[PDB]
Curated annotation (Swiss-Prot):
<dbReference type="GO" id="GO:0006817">
    <property type="term" value="P:phosphate ion transport"/>
</dbReference>
<comment type="function">
    <text>Part of the ABC transporter complex PstSACB involved in phosphate import.</text>
</comment>
<dbReference type="GO" id="GO:0055052">
    <property type="term" value="C:ATP-binding cassette (ABC) transporter complex, substrate-binding subunit-containing"/>
</dbReference>
<keyword id="KW-0592">Phosphate transport</keyword>
<dbReference type="Pfam" id="PF12849">
    <property type="entry name" value="PBP_like_2"/>
</dbReference>
<feature type="binding site">
    <location>
        <begin position="139"/>
        <end position="141"/>
    </location>
    <ligand>
        <name>phosphate</name>
    </ligand>
</feature>
<dbReference type="InterPro" id="IPR005673">
    <property type="entry name" value="ABC_phos-bd_PstS"/>
</dbReference>
<dbReference type="GO" id="GO:0035435">
    <property type="term" value="P:phosphate ion transmembrane transport"/>
</dbReference>
<comment type="similarity">
    <text>Belongs to the PstS family.</text>
</comment>
<keyword id="KW-0732">Signal</keyword>
<keyword id="KW-0346">Stress response</keyword>
<dbReference type="GO" id="GO:0042301">
    <property type="term" value="F:phosphate ion binding"/>
</dbReference>
<comment type="subunit">
    <text>The complex is composed of two ATP-binding proteins (PstB), two transmembrane proteins (PstC and PstA) and a solute-binding protein (PstS).</text>
</comment>
<keyword id="KW-0574">Periplasm</keyword>
<dbReference type="GO" id="GO:0016020">
    <property type="term" value="C:membrane"/>
</dbReference>
<feature type="binding site">
    <location>
        <position position="56"/>
    </location>
    <ligand>
        <name>phosphate</name>
    </ligand>
</feature>
<feature type="binding site">
    <location>
        <begin position="9"/>
        <end position="11"/>
    </location>
    <ligand>
        <name>phosphate</name>
    </ligand>
</feature>
């Protein structure tokens, strides 16, 4: 039995926690995962203070090479807009990218603003003031989110751009996905981006978004998987899944990566890390699904296994898988 430590992204925290828990029940191995945001997860794996790092934002091949890291995807989730609009229930408000962008730019200030009303014909929006919530900490969820907004709102692209941290035009800061969920819950008029599980687990109402193809879609597990149907994984794991074309493709979708050193100094920790993720691919699909994360197609996991053999070694050049 081994004791492993991981750290990083809160985006997959719910599933990683479940996997760890079940893994310890079934094998005795203990995986201690710390959700500190993707930014911290990357700083940590590089500082060698954990056995594996987790970031929703991929590292470039060059940067991976410069640090001696290897990254691989685990699950596919989706970022939803959680809201607290006295009167409205979940799934009923509809927004489109441009508008979502203007709300985060501080251009739209009330729920019954023309722009929103035009998008929700039958809705009776209250004239509540919108309280914008964004991440206070360095976030891979903030990266997927700002990557999507840059694609759908020109002013957002030119003035604040994309990033794990950016200069937010407006909004209160919340720490971690859980931080943002707690804020929306305590603030009438609140809107904040969170990975889907956090909205659902906390009974927070969310909106539908307009797909790249122009149709309103609900955030669900299968729609997260839809956004990924056209992803050419054979080309690379670092797949951008935001605003993808296709029927029922949720627009703010993202996979999430695990970062490990190619030259394993503590080969016993390395091996156990791989064994844990292998068990997760082989058996944790149900647990992921229960949590509304879409599993990666088998072809991709086979690619990940092949890569492990190819890239992960002890200092003797001996493969750990
Ligand atoms: O998953 P996050 O914590 O990096 O946003």
């Amino acid at each position: 039995e081994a004791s492993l430590t991981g750290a990083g992204a809160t985006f997959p925290a719910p599933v990683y926690a479940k996997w760890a828990d079940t893994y310890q029940k079934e094998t005795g191995n203990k995986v201690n995962y710390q959700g500190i945001g993707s930014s911290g997860g990357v700083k940590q794996i590089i500082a060698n203070t954990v056995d594996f790092g987790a970031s929703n934002a991929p590292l470039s091949d060059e940067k991976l090479a410069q640090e001696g890291l290897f990254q691989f995807p685990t699950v596919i989730g989706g970022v939803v807009l959680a809201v607290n609009i006295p009167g409205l229930k979940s799934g009923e408000l509809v927004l489109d990218g441009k508008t979502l962008g203007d709300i985060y730019l501080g251009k739209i200030k009330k729920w019954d603003d023309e722009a929103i009303a035009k998008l929700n014909p039958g809705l009776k929006l209250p004239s509540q003031n919108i309280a914008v919530v964004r991440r206070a900490d360095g976030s891979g969820t903030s990266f997927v989110f700002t990557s999507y907004l840059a694609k759908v709102n020109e002013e957002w692209k030119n003035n604040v751009g994309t990033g794990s941290t950016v200069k937010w035009p407006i909004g209160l800061g919340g720490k971690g996905n859980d931080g943002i969920a707690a804020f929306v819950q305590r603030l009438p008029g609140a809107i904040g981006y969170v990975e889907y599980a956090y909205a659902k687990q906390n009974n927070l109402a969310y909106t539908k978004l307009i797909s790249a193809d122009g149709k309103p879609v609900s955030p669900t597990e299968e729609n997260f998987a839809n956004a990924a149907k056209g992803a050419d994984w054979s080309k690379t794991f670092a797949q951008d899944l935001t605003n993808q074309k296709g029927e029922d493709a949720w627009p703010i979708t993202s996979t999430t990566f695990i970062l490990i050193h190619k030259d394993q100094k503590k080969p016993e920790q390395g091996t156990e890390v791989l064994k844990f993720f292998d068990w997760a691919y082989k058996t944790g699909a149900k647990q992921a699904n229960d949590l509304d994360y879409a599993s990666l197609p088998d072809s991709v996991v086979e690619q990940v296994r092949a890569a492990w053999k190819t890239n992960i070694k002890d200092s003797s050049g001996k493969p750990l898988y």
